[PDB]
């Protein structure tokens, strides 16, 4: 009788506070929210998930010796251009990239997945500029 398809939804803005949470276990939930799979009307081919703001992204937490042994790498395309940055240095320099990298590695590849990444707004420290959107705080 033809599956329901929603008309363009009005997206919800939620707020998550990352302080003390485990890096991967939180990414996994931000991925779900960005994909909008918590919504009973979920549709695989439209951006209809939530917008997710995150504060205290520099106070994310991690187990074991990952602060020293977790190595992000970037390849520049040039001979010898494989750069190695440990998690310690990344938190010290570009802390918001840590949760961003982890969320992005759990989103789908392709056009839609890159757009849902743009619906994530990651911030170091407790403040965020999206007061305009009035984000509903979420206990995850």
């Amino acid at each position: 009788m033809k599956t329901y398809v929603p008309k363009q939804v009005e997206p919800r803005w939620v707020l998550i506070d990352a302080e003390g949470k485990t890096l991967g276990r939180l990414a996994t939930k931000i991925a779900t929210l960005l994909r909008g799979k918590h919504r009973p009307d979920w549709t695989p081919n439209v951006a209809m998930g939530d917008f997710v703001v995150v504060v205290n992204a520099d106070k994310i937490r991690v187990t074991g010796k990952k602060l020293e042994q977790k190595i992000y790498t970037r390849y520049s395309g040039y001979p010898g251009g494989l750069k190695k940055i440990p998690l310690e240095k990344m938190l010290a320099t570009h802390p918001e990239r840590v949760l961003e990298h982890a969320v992005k590695g759990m989103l789908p590849k392709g056009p839609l997945g890159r757009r849902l990444f743009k619906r994530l707004k990651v911030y170091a420290g407790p403040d965020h500029p999206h007061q305009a959107q009035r984000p509903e705080k979420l206990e995850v």
């Binding site: 520049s76 395309g77 040039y78 001979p79 251009g81």
Partner: protein
């Protein structure tokens, strides 16, 4: 950290303590202060300098307003010296004393499209012994099926020069404030007539 905008005049040598000292002569000042980048307004510290007066009936309205807010005549060039906050409103050669060391930035002379021997000092090929139309050629540019490609940054033919170059740690041989002249020992990038920037050295 101090700077000034300049003009490469030409080279000569002078005689100092029975030694011949090759110099490049630079017309530096005067450089009026046109805008001040502050941490509050712009996020960093720097002076925007001006240099060489220009026909006021040659400077469009958007630039007219900019000069007006500083109270300065139209200048031909604006450049920023980074991390410089001079006390006054006009930077002259006398920010430099003889003996100080300076870094100088100009635009190198343009070789146009340049071969691999002129651009990269490649060895070329033999000029006899059977060599066949490769006397100035670069030889091999890679391997074989592994990696089956050419590295990025590979040294090859192409445009050479007419690029920003900084020569560092030149000795200041003289300052002639009556003529806004700055003598610097040794060679400076670009042609006579070219715009150059003279900053205090960063070498220790």
């Amino acid at each position: 950290m101090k700077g000034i905008l300049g003009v490469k005049v030409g080279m000569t040598r002078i005689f100092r303590d029975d030694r011949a000292v090759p110099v490049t002569v630079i017309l530096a000042g005067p450089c009026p202060v046109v805008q001040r980048r502050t941490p509050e307004k712009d996020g960093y510290t720097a002076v925007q300098l001006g240099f060489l007066p220009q026909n006021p009936k040659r400077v469009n309205r958007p630039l007219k307003g900019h000069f007006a807010k500083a109270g300065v005549e139209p200048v031909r060039i604006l450049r920023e010296i980074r991390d410089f906050n001079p006390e006054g409103d006009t930077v002259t050669v006398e920010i430099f004393k003889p003996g100080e060391r300076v870094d100088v930035t100009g635009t190198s002379k343009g070789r146009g499209f340049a071969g691999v021997m002129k651009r990269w000092n490649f060895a070329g090929g033999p000029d006899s012994h059977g060599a066949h139309k490769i006397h100035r050629h670069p030889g091999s540019i890679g391997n074989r099926k592994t990696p089956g490609r050419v590295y990025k940054g590979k040294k090859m033919a192409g445009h050479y020069g007419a690029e920003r170059v900084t020569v560092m740690n030149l000795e200041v041989v003289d300052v002639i404030p009556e003529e806004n002249l700055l003598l610097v020992k040794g060679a400076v990038p670009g042609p006579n007539g070219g715009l150059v920037i003279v900053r205090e050295t960063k070498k220790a």
